[PDB]
């Protein structure tokens with residue numbers, strides 16, 4: 014059993030529709046999300062509590078039930094096309110990528 | 114989005130040791146409970162290495178493969194941190210990052226609010 | 239029809255923080271008038287038994303949010319600092335030292351002691367003197383014959399006052415009027431969540447300001463069986479309080495009739511330093527009963543399996559590194575500060591399905607309390623005989639992180655944050671405020687005659 | 689006692705506003721002294 | 736039942752101990768942060784007396800008004816409240832009704848009765 | 858009117874706000890020179906309450922005596938005082954003999970009333 018896994022994985026997206034990414038984990042707990050672009054350090058998007066991270070321009074949101082958390086991104090804006098990762102304490106997922 | 118000042122990059126021979134370090138202003142450093150290190154290998158997801166406590170210097174590593182080859186230190190009067198890696202192998206080529214957490218309440222999960230630009234270590238012939 | 243009525247004195251309370259009153263044993267003060275914890279004036283201990291069992295009352299507790307810890311911590315630091323203000327101010331002491339290792343010693347070549355000399359000031363501006371005396375290796379660094387004190391670039395090194403005892407004195411905390419302290423009576427309580435049975439007490443009892451690192455010494459003993467408590471169990475940043483149900487006894491000693499020299503370094507400015515040592519010089523150490531320790535760990539292991547499963551392996555290991563204060567067991571015995579090698583206690587693995595352990599120790603005279611930056615205290619030497627006996631009541635442990643290919647988990651000594659010690663005694667108590675105003679319906683009309 | 693002259697080899701704006709002065713200052717050790725140098729404004733010093 | 740022993744009893748039964756609660760440091764009476772604590776206890780005590788004075792209930796543990804009870808505040812029976820509940824539960828039950836009730840007691844009873852009584856006295 | 862709105866208004870109208878004034882820190886209730894200030898507020902409150910207790914006026918906003926008003930100290934119509942004056946003005950007219958008035962409240966009413974009540978009681 015892998016402690017933290019992500020889905021759907023890399024997908025094509027169309028701007029104007031709202032994105033949805035999701036991941037699951039062993040046991041239960043708070044979960045958080047980061048955004049990463051090539052050549053750059055990652056940045057925090059959502060606090061592990063699901064509260065929006067400071068400095069984020071109100072395009073990101075999410076919630077959880079059971080062992081699963083879902084992240085959504087407003088209107089699939091191209092500015093946010095990036096690698097995305099889940100984190101649960103010590104573990105990181107394999108990540109996903111936004112394409113078009 | 115405050116950046117941590119990161120040390121430079123370079124290339125090492127197998128078996129060589131290397132030091133990686135980062136610096137901040139005193140009003141950034143004092144607020145930090147833990148300084149964490151992570152590794153980003155090409156083609157891989159992000160890997161946790163370990164952390165050092167800013168107050169006591171206590172260290173908690175991830176895989177034992179790091180524990181035997183990695184030592185973490187901190188210096189509160191210089192507002193810095195250092196990572197000492199020994200026994201480098203070709204499999205250790207990766208970008209390494211300095212990152213920090215200022216959350217003092219449990220049950221809130223881990224956070225990495227601050228990041229350095231990171232540095233590249235290349236191990237080769 | 240019903241009407242509003244008012245009831246003054248209603249027995250309702252709400253969670254609240256308020257400053258608590260310091261209380262202690264006046265007789266302890268009489269035995270030592272300058273004791274730092276006893277203080278010159280305080281509220282009496284109020285030993286009187288609890289009147290109230292609060293039948294049919296339950297409520298939520300959370301020891302991790304218990305602000306009594308912060309007040310205890312603040313007061314302990316404040317008393318310590320205040321007690322040092324009268325002290326001699328040894329700052330002029332930092333001069334170039336010129337020296338070599340101790341020679342013509344009987345010995346136990348240990349490099350722990352050096353025989354050093356320097357140009358020190360005197361009562362007169364015009365005169366200088368050579369002090370000599372001995373130093374511990376831990377207190378000095380090389381500039382190779384030239385040396386400096388290890389904390390000489392800090393704001394000050396000052397002598398502990400020669401007539402102040404640091405022996406822990408019980409401190410009780412009492413509610414202000416209109417407030418009360420509630421105590422959870424549930425056996426083997428988590429320290430968190432709903433408590434099945436509570437009671438009311440005017441003050442806390444039995445709490446002592448005992449400073450230690452890896453092993454809490456002389457604390458309360460778990461009521462029935464070893465308790466494992468933590469803020470969480472998945473977050474490896476958090477410490478675990480082991481809470482033994484039985485004590486593990488330890489003897490600690492220090493050799494050997496070390497003499498003391500009194501030096502004036504200015505008008506009336508007494509400076510104390512280590513003089514010659516009579517007879518053999520041995521490394522300081524402690525004995526822990528091997529059998530007692532082993533039975534004790536077995537009990538801890540049984541409890542850990544409750545959180546990790548019965549198909550697990552529990553491994554213990556020594557410290558991962560960091561400051562001397564976290565990597566070793568530190569304690570104050572007889573006024574001397576010891577740092578001991580505890581690795582002999584943790585070299586074991588536990589798998590589901592007259593002897594003793596001797597622990598070597600080291601001594602330094604310069605102490606930076608509570609990891610404070612820029613300040614240091616110089617302890618004057620204790621004149622030659624240390625004998626100390628203690629009760630180990632529990633450990634502060636951490637768990638190694640990282641993924642596994644197995645059910646094996648590894649635990650190490652950790653923490654070093656003194657607030658975790660205070661919490662191990664204060665978890666039983668909660669502070670609330672009493673709110674008299676209340677209203678309820680009756681049939682009365684408040685008839686009025688005018 | 690400070691021993692000094694005007695700032696020299698400066699790009700400048702002879703303004704007498706800045707002086708380049710040196711002195712023997714104490715150190716962390718009673719036995720050692722150091723040369724500090726650094727600059728002073730004219731308003732803060734007298735001959 | 737002693738200090739707060741009444742908390743384990745019904746609201747009706749608890750009324751027997753109101754004096755005991757008044758004695759047990761509700762008064763603010765003592766047997767430089769310690770000085771501030773003493774001052775605070777006094778301020779809290781006097782405030783509550785003022786509120787009773789505003790209601791015209793001063794000097795009494797139990798006081799009535801002509802302000803009617805709102806059955807919608809609790810949706811519970813008279814005997815249910817007095818026999819099947821504790822004061823701790825009750826406080827939570829009507830806890831958002833303090834602002835209105837407190838205002839009504841002053842406006843509907845105390846200032847009005849005093850004005851009407853003055854007119855009789857004239 | 859509201860707090861401080863009331864002082865300016867005719868002495869009669871002001872009576873509607875007596876509780877309002879009591880609530881708005883007149884009572885001295887507090888929400889190291891700052892500590893001294895808190896203590897003094899308490900002393901001011903208790904002193905005035907003691908006067909009311911002496912007069913038998915405690916617990917009341919409006920309290921009467923059997924001592925006649927000294928009309929020579931005010932020289933105005935009853936309705937003139939209540940409708941055409943403020944309390945700020947009124948205080949100046951009767952300020953000089955105020956020591957006498959306070960003494961009369963004790964001597965002419967309370968010392969004698971308590972003695973007579975005791976005689977009836979025994």
Ligand SMILES: *[C@@H]1O[C@H](CO)[C@@H](O[C@@H]2O[C@H](CO)[C@@H](O[C@@H]3O[C@H](CO)[C@@H](O)[C@H](O[C@H]4O[C@H](CO)[C@@H](O)[C@H](O)[C@@H]4O)[C@@H]3O)[C@H](O)[C@H]2NC(C)=O)[C@H](O)[C@H]1NC(C)=O
Pocket residue numbers: 270403405406448450455456569570571572573625626627628629
């Ligand atoms: C855990 O608890 C144990 C027991 O309570 C505790 O050990 C005790 O420590 C105290 C203080 O070190 C010991 O008391 C000493 O007893 C000797 C007996 O002759 C006295 O001479 C000592 O007096 C010294 O201090 C005086 C202060 O003015 C000086 O004037 C005098 O000259 C001495 O310097 C002192 O009273 C006590 O005997 C031990 N008990 C045992 C069983 O050894 C232990 O330290 C506690 N552990 C921790 C971590 O606190």
Ligand SMILES: *[C@@H]1O[C@H](CO)[C@@H](O[C@@H]2O[C@H](CO)[C@@H](O[C@@H]3O[C@H](CO[C@H]4O[C@H](CO)[C@@H](O)[C@H](O)[C@@H]4O)[C@@H](O)[C@H](O)[C@@H]3O)[C@H](O)[C@H]2NC(C)=O)[C@H](O)[C@H]1NC(C)=O
Pocket residue numbers: 041042043077078079219220221222469470471472
């Ligand atoms: C260490 O910290 C962890 C958090 O970082 C703690 O994890 C929490 O543990 C509790 C208890 O097991 C979990 O509660 C479960 O929640 C699920 C579903 O959630 C329901 O409620 C939400 C409210 O918004 C609702 O939206 C959902 O639809 C559900 O209605 C229940 O099914 C379970 O029965 C149980 O209640 C927490 O979920 C879990 N984390 C979070 C974020 O909830 C962990 O316990 C801590 N460890 C300790 C204290 O030792």
Ligand SMILES: *[C@@H]1O[C@H](CO)[C@@H](O[C@@H]2O[C@H](CO)[C@@H](O[C@@H]3O[C@H](CO)[C@@H](O)[C@H](O)[C@@H]3O)[C@H](O)[C@H]2NC(C)=O)[C@H](O)[C@H]1NC(C)=O
Pocket residue numbers: 190379388391
């Ligand atoms: C106060 O004085 C102490 C003692 O001199 C200072 O600590 C010393 O700081 C230096 C510089 O960081 C350390 O040097 C290091 O030595 C290792 C040796 O292998 C070398 O690899 C490093 O590159 C570096 O040169 C020195 O070891 C250290 N001494 C001790 C005993 O830890 C301290 O920094 C001073 N505080 C100040 C100036 O604020």
Ligand SMILES: *[C@@H]1O[C@H](CO)[C@@H](O[C@@H]2O[C@H](CO)[C@@H](O)[C@H](O)[C@H]2NC(C)=O)[C@H](O)[C@H]1NC(C)=O
Pocket residue numbers: 340341342343353354370371514515
């Ligand atoms: C430290 O060094 C001093 C100085 O050498 C030692 O004291 C000397 O001992 C010799 C022999 O008895 C005397 O002749 C000297 O006069 C002593 N010097 C002074 C200043 O008293 C001292 O014993 C040494 N300490 C040790 C070896 O622990």
Ligand SMILES: *[C@@H]1O[C@H](CO)[C@@H](O[C@@H]2O[C@H](CO)[C@@H](O)[C@H](O)[C@H]2NC(C)=O)[C@H](O)[C@H]1NC(C)=O
Pocket residue numbers: 337338339347348349382383384
């Ligand atoms: C005090 O003793 C130490 C040894 O315990 C001396 O340092 C040693 O000096 C020799 C050469 O003479 C070296 O080969 C050793 O490696 C040194 N040891 C260490 C730990 O560095 C020391 O010089 C003596 N006294 C002083 C003032 O240094």
Ligand SMILES: *[C@@H]1O[C@H](CO)[C@@H](O[C@@H]2O[C@H](CO)[C@@H](O)[C@H](O)[C@H]2NC(C)=O)[C@H](O)[C@H]1NC(C)=O
Pocket residue numbers: 487488489525526527594627
């Ligand atoms: C540590 O030393 C103490 C003595 O200082 C030991 O306690 C004594 O043990 C003897 C054994 O025959 C008893 O007769 C004494 O009555 C004990 N003294 C007491 C209990 O105060 C203690 O057992 C030693 N600890 C260890 C682990 O050996």
Ligand SMILES: *[C@@H]1O[C@H](CO)[C@@H](O[C@@H]2O[C@H](CO)[C@@H](O)[C@H](O)[C@H]2NC(C)=O)[C@H](O)[C@H]1NC(C)=O
Pocket residue numbers: 489490491523524525594596
């Ligand atoms: C801890 O145990 C050791 C070993 O038993 C004690 O050291 C012995 O002390 C006796 C004292 O008469 C000596 O005769 C032995 O030779 C010592 N054994 C050694 C040096 O290996 C030690 O004193 C005990 N420590 C205490 C009680 O604090």
Ligand SMILES: *[C@@H]1O[C@H](CO)[C@@H](O[C@@H]2O[C@H](CO)[C@@H](O)[C@H](O)[C@H]2NC(C)=O)[C@H](O)[C@H]1NC(C)=O
Pocket residue numbers: 494495516517622
């Ligand atoms: C430690 O020092 C004390 C003195 O401070 C020594 O006590 C001496 O004991 C002998 C025993 O017969 C007496 O004759 C001496 O008069 C004592 N000294 C004093 C100053 O009175 C004690 O013996 C010393 N211990 C060691 C190991 O030398």
Ligand SMILES: *[C@@H]1O[C@H](CO)[C@@H](O[C@@H]2O[C@H](CO)[C@@H](O)[C@H](O)[C@H]2NC(C)=O)[C@H](O)[C@H]1NC(C)=O
Pocket residue numbers: 556557558559565581
């Ligand atoms: C923990 O215990 C081990 C022994 O089981 C200590 O031994 C160290 O082992 C490493 C192996 O590479 C050596 O390089 C070290 O030199 C050994 N000791 C020291 C002091 O360096 C280890 O030190 C112990 N950790 C502590 C005491 O913190």
Ligand SMILES: *[C@@H]1O[C@H](CO)[C@@H](O[C@@H]2O[C@H](CO)[C@@H](O)[C@H](O)[C@H]2NC(C)=O)[C@H](O)[C@H]1NC(C)=O
Pocket residue numbers: 579580581582
């Ligand atoms: C703490 O105690 C352990 C155990 O005694 C020490 O480990 C020793 O390390 C040296 C390193 O050269 C080895 O040669 C010994 O054989 C080890 N002893 C063992 C394994 O029993 C460790 O060095 C001590 N740590 C410190 C800081 O002194």
Ligand SMILES: *[C@@H]1O[C@H](CO)[C@@H](O[C@@H]2O[C@H](CO)[C@@H](O)[C@H](O)[C@H]2NC(C)=O)[C@H](O)[C@H]1NC(C)=O
Pocket residue numbers: 456485627628629
């Ligand atoms: C370690 O714990 C034991 C057990 O609680 C302590 O011994 C008890 O001390 C009390 C003191 O009033 C006695 O009444 C008990 O009868 C003792 N229990 C025994 C002898 O089994 C011991 O003193 C504690 N050690 C320290 C240093 O506090």
Ligand SMILES: *[C@@H]1O[C@H](CO)[C@@H](O[C@@H]2O[C@H](CO)[C@@H](O)[C@H](O)[C@H]2NC(C)=O)[C@H](O)[C@H]1NC(C)=O
Pocket residue numbers: 293294736740741742743744745
């Ligand atoms: C706490 O609860 C118990 C019940 O569990 C109360 O016991 C009551 O005792 C009276 C005595 O006449 C009986 O009439 C009641 O029926 C009992 N209650 C129940 C539920 O059986 C006890 O009085 C309660 N504590 C307080 C302070 O009231």
Ligand SMILES: *[C@@H]1O[C@H](CO)[C@@H](O[C@@H]2O[C@H](CO)[C@@H](O)[C@H](O)[C@H]2NC(C)=O)[C@H](O)[C@H]1NC(C)=O
Pocket residue numbers: 862863865866867
């Ligand atoms: C402040 O001045 C205004 C304006 O004069 C006062 O308004 C009075 O309103 C009542 C309403 O019935 C009228 O009968 C009055 O004639 C108005 N003024 C006067 C002077 O009579 C207002 O009441 C004044 N506020 C006070 C006195 O507190």
Ligand SMILES: *[C@@H]1O[C@H](CO)[C@@H](O)[C@H](O)[C@H]1NC(C)=O
Pocket residue numbers: 336357366
């Ligand atoms: C100490 O002072 C003397 C002069 O009084 C000087 O000769 C000596 O060199 C100084 N220190 C040492 C180690 O010599």
Ligand SMILES: *[C@@H]1O[C@H](CO)[C@@H](O)[C@H](O)[C@H]1NC(C)=O
Pocket residue numbers: 425426427428431
């Ligand atoms: C501690 O909390 C856990 C989770 O609620 C519970 O299962 C356990 O029984 C508690 N322990 C005690 C002593 O109440």
Ligand SMILES: *[C@@H]1O[C@H](CO)[C@@H](O)[C@H](O)[C@H]1NC(C)=O
Pocket residue numbers: 528529532533536
């Ligand atoms: C501790 O107990 C275990 C058995 O549970 C035993 O195998 C081990 O040798 C003991 N350790 C000792 C006696 O030091």
